[PDB]
């Protein structure tokens, strides 16, 4: 099937994934299904239930509801970028890179990786929030005003098709590593070497998908398509973030998030 140094590359990536993302698909699916517990997550389905939830998040304000949700999103984004950064540094070859190429890979990778992993925490009707303690409804997110209602629905559309692939966490960690180790991000210095590094990951991903989903024989090309869709998804999402920076005088981006969007698409 596949050799040792490829098997070693796979488990390094899976273990780094298990270590760096508190929420993962196995844990999310159990909450969502959901056996293992009869105490479901608090459901945030309208303005009133939202305020109930916020009465808990006291220390962590008087802004419009849309903007407060926009703030909860930023907090979740910041720490996922943070975890993603730890995860990247653990991919063999990544830390060896120019450091600059590392910033560039992360800059263009993180949001494709975020929306890939976000699927895990979404079903057709809503998504887990607050580390699995909440569940905010899709319809409620659509019910917000523009352009805030226009942020999640595309992510849901992607997630429903992506979740149809039935990936588990071992697939997803390889997929996320391939997203980040992407040889054609703009401004990369050592395109030749990064490309070598990604073809190793992509190779481990292909053989792993053969072994883990034998009947779904075009799963890998499907995943390749998903990577192109993620790029489009992120470009459009970047466009919406720009429209908000210069149209909503009350939704400042976290500094780290300004770093990533600055000079992107």
């Amino acid at each position: 099937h596949m050799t040792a140094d490829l098997k070693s590359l796979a488990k390094r990536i899976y273990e780094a994934y298990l270590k760096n993302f508190n929420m993962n698909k196995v844990k999310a699916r159990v909450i969502l299904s959901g056996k293992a517990s009869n105490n479901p997550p608090f459901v945030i389905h309208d303005m009133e239930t939202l305020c109930m939830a916020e009465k808990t998040l006291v220390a962590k304000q008087n802004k419009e509801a849309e903007v407060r949700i926009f703030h909860c999103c930023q907090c979740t984004s910041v720490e996922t970028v943070t975890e993603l950064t730890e995860f990247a540094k653990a991919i063999p070859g990544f830390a060896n890179l120019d450091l600059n190429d590392q910033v560039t890979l992360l800059k263009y990778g993180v949001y494709e990786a975020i929306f890939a992993m976000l699927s895990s925490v979404m079903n057709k009707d809503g998504m887990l929030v607050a580390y699995g303690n909440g569940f905010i409804t899709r319809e409620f997110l659509k019910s917000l005003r523009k352009p805030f209602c226009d942020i999640m629905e595309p992510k849901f559309d992607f997630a429903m098709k992506f979740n149809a692939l039935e990936l588990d966490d071992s697939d997803i960690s390889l997929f996320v590593a391939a997203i980040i180790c992407c040889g054609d991000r703009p401004g990369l210095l050592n395109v030749g070497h990064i490309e070598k590094m990604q073809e190793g990951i992509v190779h481990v991903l292909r053989l792993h998908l053969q072994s883990n989903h034998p009947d779904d024989i075009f799963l890998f090309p499907k995943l390749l398509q998903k990577m192109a869709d993620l790029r489009q998804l992120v470009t459009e999402h970047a466009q919406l973030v720009q429209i908000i920076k210069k149209t909503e005088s009350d939704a400042a981006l976290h500094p780290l998030l300004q770093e990533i969007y600055r000079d992107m698409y």
Binding site: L99, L106, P255, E259
Partner: peptide
């Protein structure tokens, strides 16, 4: 230009 991201990659 990416000072926080640099920071994160060092620690």
């Amino acid at each position: 230009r990416h000072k926080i991201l640099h920071r994160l990659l060092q620690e």
